[PDB]
Each structure stands twice: as C-alpha cells, then as structure tokens.
C-alpha cells in the first residue's frame, strides 16, 4: 500500500525546504495518494532519460510526475493522463544582447537544453530546416541551471516550458523571453503501458475532479510564481519604519531579547526582513504574522495566535535561538549567529550539506565567509545532485542572511549607545 512516484529534483517539481518536502508535483502526488489511502514514496530520476528508463522496467514506479510534456502520439509503451497544466515553450535570451525574433536567429548562438527533453527534440527537427543551427544538450543540468547560465551569460539562448520561467524569472533579473516557439500544450502524468487501465483511470478521475474543484488553480497560484524572501528596502524606507513601526514592537523585541539572552536588535532585524514589522503580514506559502512563522512551527513555540505581535515575536525569537543553539559546537560566534540566520531560512539539513561541501572543497566548515560561498551551489545540479538533500535555492539564503545583517547594522548604529 505504497504509491511510488518518480520525479525530478527541482523547484517546479519536488525538493526539500526547511519544513520538509514540497513542490507542485509533490503536492499533487500527495493529494492523490491520499485519495487512494496509500503512502506516497518519492523516487527521483537523475535526468529525463533515466526517468523514462525507470518508468519502463518492471518493478518500477507507478507513474512519473515531472512536468512532462506528452508530445507522444501512440507509443502505447508510455501513456499519458489528462493534462493538469498548460504551457508554452519559450526562447529565452539575456538582456542587452541581440533579441532573436525568429527560429532562424537561433543560428550563431550557443544554446543549451535538457538532454532527452521534448525541447531538445523540438530543436533537433528545427535543425533539418536550418542545418546551421547548433545546440548542446546535457544530462547534468536542470532548467534552473539553464536560466542561471543565460542570466550570467555563459550561454546565449535556451528553450524551456513557460511555467519554469514563471517560477524562476524573478531570481534571474537579466533574462527575458524572446518569443513563444510552438503551440500551447498540456502537461501530464506518465505511466508505463499498459494492458490494465486499473491505475491510469483513477489518475484521470483524480485530475478531472481536481480541476473543477479549484485544486489545480490553487496550486498554480501557490507556486507560480513569486518572490518570497528578497528585498532590501531603501535606507530611506527603513528610517521611515524606524519611526512609524518599530516603536510599537521594540518593547516586545527587547523582552524576548532579555528572556532568551540574545541581542534584541537582531531579533528585530529578523522580523524586519521577515514582514517589515507588520503583525498581519502573510504569504501564500503559509507563513504568517510579524515573524512569518509556519503553523506547525508556531504551535511548536507556544504561539496560539500567529497574528498577535507579542506572541509571534516571542515564538520567532525562540525559534531562532534554538536553531542557533543546535548548530555544531565547532562553530563559534559571531559566525554562529550568521549560520543560524542561514539555517532559519534554508533549514539545517541543507545548511549541513553546505558545510560538508565546504569541507570537501578544502574550506572552513566553520567560517560563514566560506559556507556562504557554497550555499549558491545548491541550486546547481552538477553540485546538489551530489548532496544528500538535493536542490535548494541557496542564493536566496545568502540574500536572507545578508539583508538581515544589514538591518542589524543600521539598528546598532542608531541604538546607539
Ligand atoms: N524538459 C524540461 C525542459 C528542457 C529544456 O529546458 O530544454 C522540463 O521538463 O521542463
């Protein structure tokens, strides 16, 4: 009584954050496994070629959920469910470089795509029509890698499904859609063929029902797509809010500070980066209140009302100090505080991968200046594929810690002594 779903380890799909497992596919697979009264077991594939290999052996996974494009036709050997999400392939280029207008303008550019993907096949055929088109494909990269590579200019163009872009665009300021390339199409789950429609029919029953019940559109808004974390405000705006907001809460930050033997101004910085000192702030991610705590985490810290500024401040402060208390003793202050900010955001599991990765690189797993260099690698498959817990958006962790420290510095400077 265990549903095995194979997927890809990636932000649009499945990954681990500080609260455990998450992702569009993962949630859809879980709400489905529950509709079957079985346990969901995730298995992840290394690349797309391997996913389909795995799906087609006997004794393999039930189905594949991985934002797969059917394309197909009638290879009965692999069969597709109804679609649960409609997308469009898009050519992506780097801002301030020659924006291609037409398929012919893909000639002369360096292009990279997932090896074994629909899009590699979309380009393969375009190469008959223009034998000068050249492109590379790789198994050691995921779409998140491709966008970074354009953003940073290591490649000119790539070709990806629009949803992957909607989720990530914001983490890549320099990238821009050049044009749609192909008709809109639907994504779907993949099952092996196929003589018993036992398994297929309910999936199709599930997806059809979950479309009219709002579940698909709910998820789509949950994930696709938005900037949780980021945003250093003006020094202007912070000075503003020092006068308009902090006076309400300074009292609570101070006492929690005292209660827990920790600098109140860092607690106050966490909260500013968190919600901008807004006790009613909330996210579609399911965090809420001044210290943007999750429900499980709030209950765990004794917070019975997430919207009460005093409670959320006390519970968030409690959460931060414990995380800082649980790090390896080998990490000393002040780095220790920075690791905890790093862990507060990305989860200790991932932070741990970073330190191992840091060690193996001959760096100091105890120096925030070093591990901080490793955290961004967790969003690079060549690297995160080699870690225990896999993908993490480590660049956003770094911004988190940085930003929080920055507010902490201004606060110190103004307080006072
Ligand atoms: N097939 C990949 C995209 C491949 C590419 O970017 O070229 C996906 O599942 O989104």
Curated annotation (Swiss-Prot):
Main location as per UniProt: membrane
Location of the region described as LT domain in the Swiss-Prot/TrEMBL record: 228-417
Segments of this protein annotated with the region Non-LT domain: 1-227
The enzyme's E.C. designation: 4.2.2.n1
CDD domains recorded: MLTF-like, PBP2_YfhD_N
Cell location: Cell outer membrane
Listed SUPFAM superfamilies: Lysozyme-like, Periplasmic binding protein-like II
GO MF entries: peptidoglycan lytic transglycosylase activity
Alphabetical list of InterPro entries matching this protein: Lysozyme-like_dom_sf, MltF, Solute-binding_3/MltF_N, Transglyc_AS, Transglycosylase_SLT_dom_1
SMART domains assigned: PBPb
Reaction equations catalysed: Exolytic cleavage of the (1->4)-beta-glycosidic linkage between N-acetylmuramic acid (MurNAc) and N-acetylglucosamine (GlcNAc) residues in peptidoglycan, from either the reducing or the non-reducing ends of the peptidoglycan chains, with concomitant formation of a 1,6-anhydrobond in the MurNAc residue
A Gene Ontology cellular-component term: cell outer membrane
Physiological role: Murein-degrading enzyme that degrades murein glycan strands and insoluble, high-molecular weight murein sacculi, with the concomitant formation of a 1,6-anhydromuramoyl product. Lytic transglycosylases (LTs) play an integral role in the metabolism of the peptidoglycan (PG) sacculus. Their lytic action creates space within the PG sacculus to allow for its expansion as well as for the insertion of various structures such as secretion systems and flagella.
Family classification: In the N-terminal section; belongs to the bacterial solute-binding protein 3 family. In the C-terminal section; belongs to the transglycosylase Slt family.
Protein name: Membrane-bound lytic murein transglycosylase F
Organism phylogeny: Bacteria, Pseudomonadati, Pseudomonadota, Gammaproteobacteria, Pseudomonadales
Name of the gene encoding the protein in the UniProt record: mltF
């Amino acid at each position: 009584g265990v549903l095995r779903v194979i997927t890809r380890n990636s932000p649009a799909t499945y990954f681990q954050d500080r609260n455990g497992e998450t992702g569009f596919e993962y949630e859809l697979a879980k709400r489905f496994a529950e509709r079957l009264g079985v346990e969901l077991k995730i298995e992840t594939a290394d690349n797309l070629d391997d996913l389909y290999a795995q799906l087609s052996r006997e004794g393999g996974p039930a189905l594949a959920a991985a934002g797969l494009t059917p394309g197909r036709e009638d290879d009965a050997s692999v069969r597709y469910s109804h679609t649960y999400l409609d997308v469009t392939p898009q050519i992506i280029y780097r801002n301030g470089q020659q924006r291609p207008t037409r398929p012919e303008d893909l000639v002369g550019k360096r292009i990279m795509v997932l090896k074994g993907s629909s899009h590699a096949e979309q380009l393969a055929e375009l190469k008959k029509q223009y034998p000068e088109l050249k492109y590379e494909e790789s198994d050691a990269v995921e779409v998140v890698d491709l966008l970074r590579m354009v953003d940073v200019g290591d490649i000119d163009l790539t070709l990806v499904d629009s949803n992957e872009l909607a989720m990530n665009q914001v983490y890549f300021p320099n990238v821009r859609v050049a044009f749609d390339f192909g008709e809109a199409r639907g994504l779907a789950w993949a099952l092996p063929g196929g003589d018993d429609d036992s398994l297929m029919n309910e999936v199709n029953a599930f997806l059809d029902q979950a479309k009219k019940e709002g579940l698909l559109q709910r998820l789509k808004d949950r994930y696709y797509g938005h900037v949780d974390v980021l945003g250093y405000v003006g020094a202007y705006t912070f000075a503003q809010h020092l006068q308009q907001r902090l006076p309400r809460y300074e009292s609570h930050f101070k006492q929690s500070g005292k209660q827990k033997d920790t600098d109140w101004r860092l607690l106050a910085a966490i909260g500013y980066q968190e919600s901008l000192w807004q006790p009613g702030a909330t996210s579609k991610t399911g965090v809420r209140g001044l210290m943007m705590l999750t429900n499980r985490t709030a209950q765990a810290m004794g917070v019975s009302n997430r919207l009460d500024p005093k409670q959320s401040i006390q519970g968030g402060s409690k959460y931060f100090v414990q995380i800082r208390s649980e790090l390896p003793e080998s990490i000393k202050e002040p780095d220790r505080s920075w690791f905890a900010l790093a862990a507060y955001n990305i989860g200790g599991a991932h932070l741990e991968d970073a330190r191992k990765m840091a060690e193996k690189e001959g760096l100091n797993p105890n120096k925030w200046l070093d591990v901080k260099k490793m955290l961004p690698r967790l969003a690079q498959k060549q690297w995160y594929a080699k870690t225990r817990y896999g993908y993490a958006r480590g660049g956003e962790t770094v911004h988190f810690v940085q930003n929080v420290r920055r507010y902490y510095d201004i606060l110190t400077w103004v307080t006072q002594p």
